[PDB]
C-alpha cells in the first residue's frame with residue numbers, strides 16, 4: 509500500500525516562514541501527483557497546491573500566489589511546502605495528499621483525485637510562547653459512581669499551543685474514553701479533561717495511567733489515577 | 739555540391755541542407771562481410787538520427803522551430819554576428835559544451 513508521513517507541529521511568529529515535509533512509501537515518486545491542502549479550525553478544506561514531480565511546474569491558487577512554494581526531492585522522496593508571510597489566519601491543519609494520473613498525449617494529463625491522505629500537521633502563529641502542560645488526576649470517588657460504574661480521568665491545564673495527545677494504559681483501554689475538545693480561557697491558554705468510565709469493582713484491582721504528550725514543548729507525562737484516600 | 743558551403747556563413751549554408759541530407763543514405767567472403775557492415779552502420783546512424791528528430795517533434799523536417807527559449811549563458815552573440823559572420827564548424831566548436839543540456843531540454847519540452 510501507499511503511505512504518507514509528515515513532520516510535527518509548528519509554532520511561528522507573524523511575518524516569518526514555515527516549511528513542512530511529506531515522505532511517501534509504496535509508489536514510484538516521479539510519476540505520482542502530490543498535493544498540499546489546508547483546513548482552518550471550524551472551516552472547510554482549501555486546496556493549496558499540487559503537481560507531478562516529473563513535469564516540474566507546480567500549480568497554485570491565485571490567493572496564495574507569491575507566498576507558497578512546492579518542491580520535491582526524489583533522492584529522499586520527500587515533497588516540501590514553504591509558506592511565507594504568515595498572518596493571524598494561517599493557523600490551521602495542513603494535509604499532504606497523493607493521487608494517480610495518466611497522459612493522453614500532447615501535454616494532456618488526467619487525474620483521479622486524492623486517494624491517499626496524511627495525518628496532518630498543526631501550524632500556529634501567535635505572540636505567546638511555549639508552555640509545559642500541567643496534569644491533574646480527576647480521582648474517582650463515591651460521587652462518580654452510578655450503577656456500579658465509576659468515572660475517572662485526567663485534566664490538562666496551562667499549556668500552549670495545540671495539540672496534546674492523551675492515551676490510557678498506552679492505548680490498551682479505548683472503550684468508554686471521552687476526550688473533550690480543548691477550550692480557550694481569558695488567560696490565553698488552553699485546557700481540557702479526558703475521562704473514562706470503568707466498572708467500580710476494577711478500581712481496586714486495575715491500575716489506570718493517563719499518558720499525555722505535548723510535542724511543541726517536548727513534554728511526556730504519565731499520571732496514575734487512583735480513588736482518593738479517605 | 740556536397741559540402742559546398744563549408745566555408746560560407748551559417749546563413750548561406752541553411753539553403754542547401756538537402757545536398758548533405760541526400761549524401762547520407764546511398765551517396766571473397768572476407769571482403770564481402772566488411773562492405774556489408776559499412777552499409778548496416780550507415781543505415782543504423784540514419785535511423786538513430788531520424789528517431790531523435792521524431793522524438794523532438796520534428797519528424798520529416800530539415801528546419802524545425804521549437805518552444806525552448808535560448809539561454810543567454812549558452813552564447814551571448816547577437817543574430818547579426820552568428821548568421822552573417824560565422825560558419826557551422828566554428829559554431830559547433832563553441833556550443834559543444836552545452837549540446838547535451840539543449841538536447842535534454844528539447845526532449846522534456848516536447849514530451850510535456
Ligand SMILES: *[C@@H]1O[C@H](CO)[C@@H](O[C@@H]2O[C@H](CO)[C@@H](O[C@@H]3O[C@H](CO)[C@@H](O)[C@H](O)[C@@H]3O)[C@H](O)[C@H]2NC(C)=O)[C@H](O)[C@H]1NC(C)=O
Nearest residue numbers: 509510511512513514531532533534535536537584585626
Ligand atoms: C511494490 O513494492 C514496493 C517496494 O517493495 C512496496 O512498498 C512497500 O510497502 C510497504 C507496505 O506495504 C511499506 O512498509 C511500510 O513502511 C513504513 C516504515 O515501516 C511504514 O509506513 C509501515 O509500517 C510499513 O512498514 C514499505 O516501506 C514499502 N517499501 C518501499 C521501498 O517503499 C509496495 O507495497 C508494493 N506494492 C504492492 C501493490 O504490492
